[model samples]
Target chain A: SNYCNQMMKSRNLTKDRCKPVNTFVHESLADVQAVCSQKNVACKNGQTNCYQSYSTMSITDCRETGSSKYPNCAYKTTQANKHIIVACEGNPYVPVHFDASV
Target chain B: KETAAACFERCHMDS
Candidate 1:
């Protein structure tokens, strides 16, 4: 539904400008949270709070188009099943960063 | 798709 857009805005990823590469999970929040117990990995930004998914999962990638201009930014939809890397936080462990997909 | 690709490239230009 509005998970991607809502999460993007809530996470401040779209505060200054639209984030170029962001992945939104279509699976349940619990499934994504389970990644915390999978394996630890270095984030793309070199952070230590990253975790890798144990298996491929449904995800949507929002990629900004070249013609997108700031406030009028546009994104392309890409659906893929790949192991994801994300940064987790909070007591229940929630994904806060979309590191990458592999 | 071209637009997306172009933007994707531009996004990494400053990275």
Candidate 2:
């Protein structure tokens, strides 16, 4: 329920064998959702509802292993601290999905 | 980023 294997699976990020590049922020989902209420910015998708984190956060970067066969959905994890950018929407105005990291 | 509601719904099912 914690590792990238189970986490990405639960997040449906391994649907196509494995997601190319996905990240997991170590903070609670609520903390990330709280970022939506921080600074509003533009998204790579050209949306204006994206938000940027004010400070660096601990996170895990999950890179799909090309050598991994389907159903296995293997990924290599790398840890880092970076600012987060995520898209936000809905009535509560929360982060819907991660957009990028810096 | 995924630009669809279903993606959010599926990934964020616990919420």
Candidate 3:
């Protein structure tokens, strides 16, 4: 699904909501890795996906074998082909939490 | 209970 402008803005790491909701970086990253491993989820390294040489740390996808550079970034289904992203902090860059209903 | 019509309306409208 195509993202609306508002949803695209949400993907930015500099924005207030885009920032990881975690109070502590270390704890949040650890939690993301542990949970994804338990659920057998794979995360794509954001470093490889960003077009610019400098991109902020964020989890971009969690889907398997995606078309994008970060094939394993966090992905949320919108309606049909539409999808939104949720970024988190970790080695694999798994998001801390996600809302499927959104 | 509400009428079934009302339920359907709400669901269709996603209210």
DockQ each candidate and list the results.
Answer: 0.03, 0.22, 0.01
Clashing pairs in 3: A1-A81, A1-A82, A2-A82, A60-A73, A60-A74, A61-A72, A61-A73, A61-A74, A62-A73, A62-A74
Which lDDT tens digits does candidate 1 get at residues A37-93? 789998877778889998998877777778865665566777788897877776666
Assign candidate 2 its CAPRI class.
incorrect
Stretches of candidate 2 off by over 4 Å are A10-12, B1-15
Q: What TM-scores do the predictions have?
A: 0.67, 0.76, 0.18
Top lDDT model: 2
lDDT of 3 by residue, A12-45 (tens): 3223333222111112333333333333222344
Residue by residue across B1-15, what tens digits does model 2's lDDT show?
A: 655545754453232
Residue B13, candidate 2: how far off, in angstroms? Answer: 12
lDDT of 1 by residue, B1-15 (tens): 434323322221111
Error of 3 at A15 (Å): 8.0
Q: Give the DockQ (C-alpha) for candidate 2.
A: 0.22
The 10-residue segment with the lowest total lDDT in model 2 chain A = A1-10
Error of 1 at A60 (Å): 1.0
